[PDB]
Structure formats: structure tokens, C-alpha cells
Coordinates of C-alpha atoms and ligand atoms in Angstrom, one line a residue:
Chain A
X1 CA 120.8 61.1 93.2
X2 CA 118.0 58.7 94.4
X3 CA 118.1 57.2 98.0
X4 CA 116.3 53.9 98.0
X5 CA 115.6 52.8 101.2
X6 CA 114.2 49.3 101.6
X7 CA 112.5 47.4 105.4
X8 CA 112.9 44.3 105.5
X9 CA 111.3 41.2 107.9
X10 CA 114.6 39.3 106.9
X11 CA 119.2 41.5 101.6
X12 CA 118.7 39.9 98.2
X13 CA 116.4 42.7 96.8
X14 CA 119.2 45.5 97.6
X15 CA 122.1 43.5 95.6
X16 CA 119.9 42.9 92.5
X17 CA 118.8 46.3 92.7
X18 CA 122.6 47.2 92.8
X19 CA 123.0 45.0 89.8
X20 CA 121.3 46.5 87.6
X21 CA 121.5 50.3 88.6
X22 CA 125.1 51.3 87.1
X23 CA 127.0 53.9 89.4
X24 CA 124.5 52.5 92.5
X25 CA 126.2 51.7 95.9
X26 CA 124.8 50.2 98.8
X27 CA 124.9 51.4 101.8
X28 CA 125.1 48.9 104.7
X29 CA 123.7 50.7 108.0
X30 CA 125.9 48.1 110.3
X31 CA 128.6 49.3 109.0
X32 CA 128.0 51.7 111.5
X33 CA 126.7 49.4 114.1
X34 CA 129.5 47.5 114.6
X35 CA 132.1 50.1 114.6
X36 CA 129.8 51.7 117.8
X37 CA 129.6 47.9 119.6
X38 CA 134.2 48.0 119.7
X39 CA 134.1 51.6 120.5
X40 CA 132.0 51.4 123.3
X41 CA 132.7 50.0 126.9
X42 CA 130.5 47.7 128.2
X43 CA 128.2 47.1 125.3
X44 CA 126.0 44.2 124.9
X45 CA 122.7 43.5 122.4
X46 CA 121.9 44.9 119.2
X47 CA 124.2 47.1 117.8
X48 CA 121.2 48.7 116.2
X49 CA 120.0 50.1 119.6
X50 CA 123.5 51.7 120.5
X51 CA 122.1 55.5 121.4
X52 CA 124.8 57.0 118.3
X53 CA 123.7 54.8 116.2
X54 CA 120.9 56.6 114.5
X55 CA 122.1 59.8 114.3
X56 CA 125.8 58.5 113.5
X57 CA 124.7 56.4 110.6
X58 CA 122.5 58.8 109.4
X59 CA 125.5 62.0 109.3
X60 CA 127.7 59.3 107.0
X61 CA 124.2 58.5 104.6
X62 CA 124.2 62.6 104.2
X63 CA 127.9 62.7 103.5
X64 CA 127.2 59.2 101.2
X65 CA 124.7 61.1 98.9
X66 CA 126.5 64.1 98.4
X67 CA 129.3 61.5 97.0
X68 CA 127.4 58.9 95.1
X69 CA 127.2 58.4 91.3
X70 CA 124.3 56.9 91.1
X71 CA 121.0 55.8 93.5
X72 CA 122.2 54.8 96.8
X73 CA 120.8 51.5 98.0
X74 CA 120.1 51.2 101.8
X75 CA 118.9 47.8 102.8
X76 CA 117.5 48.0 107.3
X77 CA 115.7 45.6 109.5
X78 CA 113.5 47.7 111.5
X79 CA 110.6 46.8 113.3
X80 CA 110.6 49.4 116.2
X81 CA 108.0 52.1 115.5
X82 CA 110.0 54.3 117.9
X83 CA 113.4 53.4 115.6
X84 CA 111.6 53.8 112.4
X85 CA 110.3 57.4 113.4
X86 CA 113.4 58.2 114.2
X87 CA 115.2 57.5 111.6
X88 CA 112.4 58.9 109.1
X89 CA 112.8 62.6 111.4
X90 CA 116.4 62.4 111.0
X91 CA 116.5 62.2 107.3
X92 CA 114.5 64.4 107.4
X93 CA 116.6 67.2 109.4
X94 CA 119.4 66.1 107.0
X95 CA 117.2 67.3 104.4
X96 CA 117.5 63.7 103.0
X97 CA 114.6 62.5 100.8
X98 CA 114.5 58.8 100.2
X99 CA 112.4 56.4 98.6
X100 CA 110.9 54.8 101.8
X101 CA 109.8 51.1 100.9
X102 CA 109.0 48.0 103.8
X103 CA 108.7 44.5 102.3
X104 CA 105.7 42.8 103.1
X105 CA 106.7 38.9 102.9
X106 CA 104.9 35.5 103.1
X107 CA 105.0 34.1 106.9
X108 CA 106.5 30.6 105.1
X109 CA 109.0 32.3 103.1
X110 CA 109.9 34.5 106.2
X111 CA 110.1 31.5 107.9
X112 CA 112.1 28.8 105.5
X113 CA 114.7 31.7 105.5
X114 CA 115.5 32.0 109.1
X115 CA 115.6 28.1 108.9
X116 CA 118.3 28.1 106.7
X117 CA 120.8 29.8 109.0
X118 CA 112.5 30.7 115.8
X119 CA 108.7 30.8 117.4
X120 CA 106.2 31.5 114.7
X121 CA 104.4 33.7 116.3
X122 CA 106.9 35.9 117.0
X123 CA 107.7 36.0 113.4
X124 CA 103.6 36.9 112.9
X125 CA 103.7 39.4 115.5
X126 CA 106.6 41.1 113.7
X127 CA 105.6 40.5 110.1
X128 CA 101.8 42.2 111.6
X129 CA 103.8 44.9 112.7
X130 CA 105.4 45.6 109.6
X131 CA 101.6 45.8 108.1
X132 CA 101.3 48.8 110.4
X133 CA 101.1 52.5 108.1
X134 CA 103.7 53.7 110.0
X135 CA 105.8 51.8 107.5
X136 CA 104.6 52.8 104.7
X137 CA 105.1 52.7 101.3
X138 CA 104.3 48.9 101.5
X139 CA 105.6 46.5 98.9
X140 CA 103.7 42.8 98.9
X141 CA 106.3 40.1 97.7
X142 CA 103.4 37.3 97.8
X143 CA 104.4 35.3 94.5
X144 CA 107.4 37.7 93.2
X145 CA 111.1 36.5 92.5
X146 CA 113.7 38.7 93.9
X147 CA 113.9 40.3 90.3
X148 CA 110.3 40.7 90.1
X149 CA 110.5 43.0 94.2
X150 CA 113.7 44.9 92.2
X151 CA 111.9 45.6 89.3
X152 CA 108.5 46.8 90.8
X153 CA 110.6 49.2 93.4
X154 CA 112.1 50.4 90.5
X155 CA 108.6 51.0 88.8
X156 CA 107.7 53.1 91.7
X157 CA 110.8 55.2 92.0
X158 CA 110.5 55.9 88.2
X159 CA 114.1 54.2 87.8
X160 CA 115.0 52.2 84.5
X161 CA 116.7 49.0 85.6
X162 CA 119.9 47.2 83.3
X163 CA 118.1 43.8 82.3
X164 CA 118.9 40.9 84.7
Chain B
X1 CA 86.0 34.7 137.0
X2 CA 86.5 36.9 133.5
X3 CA 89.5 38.9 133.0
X4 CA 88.9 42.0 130.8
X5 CA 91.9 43.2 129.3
X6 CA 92.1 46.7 127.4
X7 CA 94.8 47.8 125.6
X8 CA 94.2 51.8 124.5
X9 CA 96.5 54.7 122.9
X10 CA 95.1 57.4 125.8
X11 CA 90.9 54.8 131.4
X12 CA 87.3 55.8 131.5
X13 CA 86.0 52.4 129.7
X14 CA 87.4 50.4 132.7
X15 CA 85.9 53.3 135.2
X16 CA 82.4 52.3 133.4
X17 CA 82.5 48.8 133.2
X18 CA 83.4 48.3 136.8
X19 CA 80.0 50.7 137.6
X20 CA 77.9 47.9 135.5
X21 CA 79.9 44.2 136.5
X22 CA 78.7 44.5 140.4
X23 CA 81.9 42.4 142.3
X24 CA 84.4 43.8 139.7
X25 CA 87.5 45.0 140.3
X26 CA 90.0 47.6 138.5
X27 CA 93.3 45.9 138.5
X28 CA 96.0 49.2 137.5
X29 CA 99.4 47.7 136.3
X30 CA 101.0 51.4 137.0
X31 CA 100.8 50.6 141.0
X32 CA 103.3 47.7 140.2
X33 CA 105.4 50.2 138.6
X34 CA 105.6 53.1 141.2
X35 CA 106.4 50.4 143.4
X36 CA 109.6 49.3 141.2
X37 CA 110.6 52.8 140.5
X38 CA 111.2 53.8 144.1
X39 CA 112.7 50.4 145.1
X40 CA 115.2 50.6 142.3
X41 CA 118.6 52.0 142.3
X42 CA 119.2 54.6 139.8
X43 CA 116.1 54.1 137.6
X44 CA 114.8 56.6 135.5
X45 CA 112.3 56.7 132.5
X46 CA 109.3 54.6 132.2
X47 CA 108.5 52.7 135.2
X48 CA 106.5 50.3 132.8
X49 CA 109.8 49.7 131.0
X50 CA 111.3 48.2 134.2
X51 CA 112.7 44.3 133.7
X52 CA 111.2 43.2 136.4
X53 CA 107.4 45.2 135.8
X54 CA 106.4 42.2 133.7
X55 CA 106.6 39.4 135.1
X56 CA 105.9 41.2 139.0
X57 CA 102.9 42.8 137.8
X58 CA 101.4 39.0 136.3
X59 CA 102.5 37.3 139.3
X60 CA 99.8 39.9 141.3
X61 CA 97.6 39.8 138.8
X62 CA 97.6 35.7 139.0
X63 CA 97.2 36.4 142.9
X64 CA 94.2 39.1 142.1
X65 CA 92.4 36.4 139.7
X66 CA 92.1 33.6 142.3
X67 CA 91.2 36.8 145.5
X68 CA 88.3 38.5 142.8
X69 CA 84.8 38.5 143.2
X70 CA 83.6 39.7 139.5
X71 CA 85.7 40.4 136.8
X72 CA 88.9 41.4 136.9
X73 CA 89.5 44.4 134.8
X74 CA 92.9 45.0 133.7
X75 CA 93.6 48.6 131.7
X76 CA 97.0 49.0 130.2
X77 CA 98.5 51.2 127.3
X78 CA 101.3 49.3 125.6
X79 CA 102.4 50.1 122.0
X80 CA 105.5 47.8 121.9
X81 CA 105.0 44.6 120.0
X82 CA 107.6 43.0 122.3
X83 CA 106.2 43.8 125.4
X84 CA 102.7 43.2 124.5
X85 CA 103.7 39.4 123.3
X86 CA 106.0 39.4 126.5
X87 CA 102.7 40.2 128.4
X88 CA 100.2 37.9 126.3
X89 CA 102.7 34.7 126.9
X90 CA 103.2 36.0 130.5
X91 CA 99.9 35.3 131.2
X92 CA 99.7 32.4 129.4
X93 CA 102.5 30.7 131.4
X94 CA 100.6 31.7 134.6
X95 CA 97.7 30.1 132.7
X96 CA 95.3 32.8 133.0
X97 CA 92.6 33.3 130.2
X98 CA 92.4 37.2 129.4
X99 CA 89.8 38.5 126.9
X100 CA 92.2 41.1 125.4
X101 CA 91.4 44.0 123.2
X102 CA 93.1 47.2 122.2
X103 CA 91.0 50.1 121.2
X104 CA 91.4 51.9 118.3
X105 CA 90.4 55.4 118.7
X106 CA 89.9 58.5 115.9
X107 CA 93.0 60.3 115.9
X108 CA 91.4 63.6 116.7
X109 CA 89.7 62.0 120.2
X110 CA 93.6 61.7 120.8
X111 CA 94.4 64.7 120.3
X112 CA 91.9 66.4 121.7
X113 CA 92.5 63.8 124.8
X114 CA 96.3 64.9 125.3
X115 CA 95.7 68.1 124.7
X116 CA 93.3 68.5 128.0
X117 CA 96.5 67.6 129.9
X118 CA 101.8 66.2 121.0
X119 CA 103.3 65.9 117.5
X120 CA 100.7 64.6 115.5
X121 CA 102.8 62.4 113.2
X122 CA 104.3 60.6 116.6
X123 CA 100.3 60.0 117.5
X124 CA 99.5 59.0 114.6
X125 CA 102.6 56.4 114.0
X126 CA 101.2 55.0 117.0
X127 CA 97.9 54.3 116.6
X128 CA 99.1 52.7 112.9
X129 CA 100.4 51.0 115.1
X130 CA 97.9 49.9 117.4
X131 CA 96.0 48.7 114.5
X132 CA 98.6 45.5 113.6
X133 CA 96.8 42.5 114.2
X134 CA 99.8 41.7 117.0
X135 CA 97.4 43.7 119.0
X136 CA 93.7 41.7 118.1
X137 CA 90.9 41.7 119.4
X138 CA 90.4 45.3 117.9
X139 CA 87.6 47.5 119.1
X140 CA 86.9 50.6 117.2
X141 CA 85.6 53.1 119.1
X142 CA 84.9 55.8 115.9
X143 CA 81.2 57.4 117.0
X144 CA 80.9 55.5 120.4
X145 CA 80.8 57.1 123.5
X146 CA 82.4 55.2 126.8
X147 CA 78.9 53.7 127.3
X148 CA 78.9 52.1 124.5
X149 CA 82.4 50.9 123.9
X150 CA 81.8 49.2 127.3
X151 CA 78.5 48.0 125.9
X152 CA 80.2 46.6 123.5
X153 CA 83.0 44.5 125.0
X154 CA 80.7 43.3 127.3
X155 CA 78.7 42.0 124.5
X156 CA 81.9 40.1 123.2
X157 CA 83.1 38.6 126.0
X158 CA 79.6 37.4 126.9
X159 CA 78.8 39.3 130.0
X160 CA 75.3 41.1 131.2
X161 CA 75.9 44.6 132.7
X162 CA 73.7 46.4 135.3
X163 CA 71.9 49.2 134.0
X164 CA 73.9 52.7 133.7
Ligands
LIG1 CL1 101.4 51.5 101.3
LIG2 CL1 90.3 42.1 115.5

């Protein structure tokens, strides 16, 4: 069944997704991460760049698609090149094909969110980074509702969404 | 006096500037990290990935900016969007005013440039990359030779050069 796999600068998009694709399940990727970070001795930083975290994540997606009903949903916050080839090669390998999306997001709306839980231009740098083809297919959010994101990745996976 | 600072995915644009700014100098970042690598414990990988390569390496070049002639001229190859805004608020702190560009080159003048000494998708993802605006001022160098790529960021930054 479909893997749709969504990049993110920021969550919301994957949960309405899941709301309105019956049999869908999303698949949270730290999950994985933070089982690695109390496994390991003397970890510190992102669990995201634990070494067995890619490939470790990546085995349980396989085993997760051979078991899911319906589209699996995986929302990541990437914006390593380096990570994101990786990743893209070991789906690959896995003979995995996904929908591959990265959200492209307004710098304000980007910003108003890490507010309410930060240099911006750091958060330029990253959201020019995410701009990069290396993370294509690009989806532009400028104007859209989180329904609206859903429902145009939807469109392009040639999914028919349950209304809101 | 200026500081030219060029950013490329491969070298010989620095070679030709410094034979047409009479009292330049070539500043190379790699002798910083050769130094670091064999005074360092253990190390293995990419000198330029040291902790210590960035802000050692600014520190010299700060010391290089006040000793210099001509123009100091500075090439690096970074693809990280980390450690290039590392770098670019490095020098900033040390309040040194570089005219930075990153060269963006035909994929095939990559190629064939590696080759003389490569997965094409892992080239390709980084000069995708290269192409953020993260990494502005951009220079592209499709149909120029090194003459005139120099030609033209001396033209930028304002400077006359000596005949070839
Ligand atoms: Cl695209
Ligand atoms: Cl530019």
C-alpha cells in the first residue's frame, strides 16, 4: 500500500492525512530514535544522528508496509543532504517506493510556530536549504490550511481523501 | 584590503586570480586542518570536520587580513549549511568583511573534474545543493572558462586585474 513520506521545516499535515485515509498509520521515525539514545552508552545530541538509526528505522518501515492496511504515513525533519540521501538509497535497497514530498513553508509561519514552544536566519538558511532539488518533490504551503497541504498531497499521490 | 572568498563543489579560479591582483595572497583553509589532524588524539575522517578547524582557521585568517598586501583570497569547498553559517558568523564576530561566492558549476565539468583523479546522484545532490540561496553570492560558471570566472568576480567585487 502507499508510503507517504512528508519533510518538514517544523506534524499537523501527517495526522489530517491520517484522518481522512481509513486503514492509514503513521509511522513516527523517533520511535526509533529514542529507543537508540537508552540503548546506547554515552549518547548525547540528536537521536537522529545515532549511526543505527537510519538503517534501524528504515528495516522496521520495511517490516511496517508489509503489515499495513492502508497508506503508511511517515512525517521526518531532515535537513542534512547527506541524511536525506541516505535515507532515499536505503529505501531504496529495501525496495521501498514512497511518495517523497518536502514542505516548503512561509519563514513567518515557520517562525510563529517555533515561538509557540530561535535566530532567523538560521531558520532562512534551513528553510533555503529545503528549496535545494535534492529534496524534491516540493510542496509550497504559502496560503494553504493544513487541509488544503493534505488534500493537495493527496492529489499528487492519486489518493481519495474521507471529507474533513 | 579585500577578502575573496570562494565556495566551489571541485582551486584553479584562486590560482588565476592571484596571477592578476599583484600583492595577493592564497590563504588555504586545508593547512589549518593537517595541522589539527596530526595534533589530535585519535582523529580520523575529515580534517575540515574537526571542532576546533573553525574557529582556528578564522582566528589565522583574522591574523592574515591585518599581515596582507593585496587581497586575501580564501578558497574553500563546504557543502554543509551548518558549517557554512558557522563560517559566515565566524567571520563576522572577528568582524572581517568577506566578498563570498559559491560557484555553481555544470554537472558534467564535475564529473569529468573527479574523474581526472563518483556516483552521479551523490554529485548531483550536492550541487542542488550548492544552489540554496544559504550559499549566495552565486556565480555560475556554465560556458566560462577560469579566465573568465575570475573576470567575473573581479568585476563584482569591484577590483581591476593585471592583464593575463
Ligand atoms: Cl519539485
Ligand atoms: Cl546569488
Amino acid at each position: 500500500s502507499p508510503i507517504i513520506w512528508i519533510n518538514g521545516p517544523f506534524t499537523h499535515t501527517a495526522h489530517t492525512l491520517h484522518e481522512r485515509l481509513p486503514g492509514s498509520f503513521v509511522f513516527e521515525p523517533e520511535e526509533m530514535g529514542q529507543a537508540l539514545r537508552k540503548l546506547t552508552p554515552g549518547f548525547s545530541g540528536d537521536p537522529q544522528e545515532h549511526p543505527m538509526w537510519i538503517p534501524l528505522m528504515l528495516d522496521a518501515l520495511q517490516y511496517a508496509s508489509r503489515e499495513a492496511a492502508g497508506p503508511l504515513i511517515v512525517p521526518v525533519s531532515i535537513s542534512d543532504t547527506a541524511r536525506h540521501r541516505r535515507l532515499m538509497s536505503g529505501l531504496k535497497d529495501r525496495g521501498l517506493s514512497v511518495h517523497h514530498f518536502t514542505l516548503i513553508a512561509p519563514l513567518n509561519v515557520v517562525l510563529e510556530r517555533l515561538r509557540r514552544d530561535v535566530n532567523v536566519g538560521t531558520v532562512e538558511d534551513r528553510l533555503n536549504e529545503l528549496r535545494g532539488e535534492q529534496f524534491q518533490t516540493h510542496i509550497d504551503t504559502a496560503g494553504l490550511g493544513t487541509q488544503q497541504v493534505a488534500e493537495q498531497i493527496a492529489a499528487q499521490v492519486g489518493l481519495t481523501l474521507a471529507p474533513p
